[PDB]
Write a structure and sequence with these properties.
mainly alpha; UBX domain-containing protein 6
């Protein structure tokens, strides 16, 4: 990344484990994120998987009730959007792996590496 004073994603991996002593929940975050990234990694042509709405049980009961696990997700290259619809006059947010990171798959690779290298 930019480096110096610890890169963002790396910095957020650190806060997650240090502030949240409950390793069950830390791992619950990791499981969910690694799983979401797996569908994108194993089938890179299926761009259709790179979509994660935040208003969902797995997110709300775990990642939303967790540490800077959310910051990690955005730091790996995801952006929040509010949907372009006319059914919902309120912001339904969606995490999407942004084109800025699509162009550099090696960065996503390092970001899943960083997360496992939580030693």
């Amino acid at each position: 990344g930019s480096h110096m004073s610890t890169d963002p994603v790396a910095a957020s991996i650190m806060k997650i484990y240090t502030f949240n002593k409950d390793q069950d929940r830390v791992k619950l975050g990791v499981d969910t994120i690694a799983k979401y990234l797996d569908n994108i990694h194993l089938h890179p042509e299926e761009e259709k998987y790179r979509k994660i709405k935040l208003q969902n049980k797995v997110f709300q009961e775990r990642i939303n009730c967790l540490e800077g696990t959310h910051e990690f997700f955005e730091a790996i290259g995801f952006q929040k959007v509010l949907l372009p619809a006319q059914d919902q006059e309120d912001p339904e947010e969606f995490y999407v792996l942004s084109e800025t990171t699509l162009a550099q798959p090696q960065s996503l690779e390092r970001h899943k590496e960083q997360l496992l290298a939580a030693e």
